[PDB]
């Protein structure tokens with residue numbers, strides 16, 4: 001009754017009142033020095049106790065207390081590993097975490113509570129985990145699906161999870177034969193996430209995986225406009241539009257809230273040519289599980 005992989009789905013095994021206590025096994029900065037901020041890839045032990053799947057999130061409760069002396073409110077992070085984890089044994093989970101640092105209106109530097117806690121983790125440290133959480137970003141059941149994945153920044157996370165399942169693992173009950181197409185938008189080359197893994201998947205499975213980067217501070221269209229994800233999609237617009245008409249095409253979008261706006265402009269321009277109102281047609285595709293969005 002869903003087109004997505006929800007059979008036996010588990011949500012909310014661990015709740016904030018009694019989280020699962022994992023251990024940090026690894027934590028590595030995956031961005032270079034020429035990135036506006038730092039993004040970190042981290043691995044936690046789970047003892048096989050968190051039965052998550054591709055597209056789900058976990059909550060993290062940062063150590064310490066809020067200003068009223070209460071445990072910190074959980075923050076959600078899209079799981080960056082496949083169900084088996086990076087080590088193929090269902091005993092780890094990985095996150096892709098941007099360290100939040102900003103300057104407020106008074107001019108003071110503010111550090112995000114949970115993202116700085118996570119990026120500062122050392123191997124051996126305890127981590128309080130909740131979940132798994134979510135059903136919107138579950139993968140399509142159809143092993144022959146066209147899966148279009150639209151990511152900005154840490155929005156790559158659930159797509160790393162999908163792609164590990166599709167291309168880096170053997171699953172008797174899921175032999176991917178379709179077309180996975182990832183668009184990843186970041187500002188600089190040093191901000192690219194998982195470039196090596198992705199480019200290996202593309203060398204590995206060229207018939208089944210397409211990869212486009214949109215490096216906005218480095219690439220421009222014919223008019224000289226910055227190469228965001230939508231700018232890159234424009235170069236394949238008619239093909240993307242024809243793909244969307246098909247019953248086995250599924251679009252997923254993940255990352256920074258607001259990334260959906262420029263994408264909508266591309267889709268509006270495609271749809272209007274055919275006398276279709278994209279703002280109305282998008283609602284239909286969402287209901288049909290073919291337009292699946294998780295932005296934050």
Ligand SMILES: Cc1cc2nc3c(=O)[nH]c(=O)nc-3n(C[C@H](O)[C@H](O)[C@H](O)COP(=O)(O)OP(=O)(O)OC[C@H]3O[C@@H](n4cnc5c(N)ncnc54)[C@H](O)[C@@H]3O)c2cc1C
Pocket residue numbers: 057075076077078079096097098099100102103104111112113114115116154155157294296
């Ligand atoms: C479903 C889901 C999936 C997510 N997946 C990921 C992921 O894969 N990777 C990842 O890094 N994050 C992810 N996030 C975001 C994550 O949950 C946190 O919101 C993020 O890490 C920042 O939390 P923090 O505790 O560090 O910052 P906080 O200490 O919570 O500070 C952020 C808060 O500060 C306030 N604020 C005021 N001005 C600003 C400003 N200028 N900029 C920012 N905040 C401001 C706002 O109230 C804001 O909510 C996801 C969120 C959701 C909901």
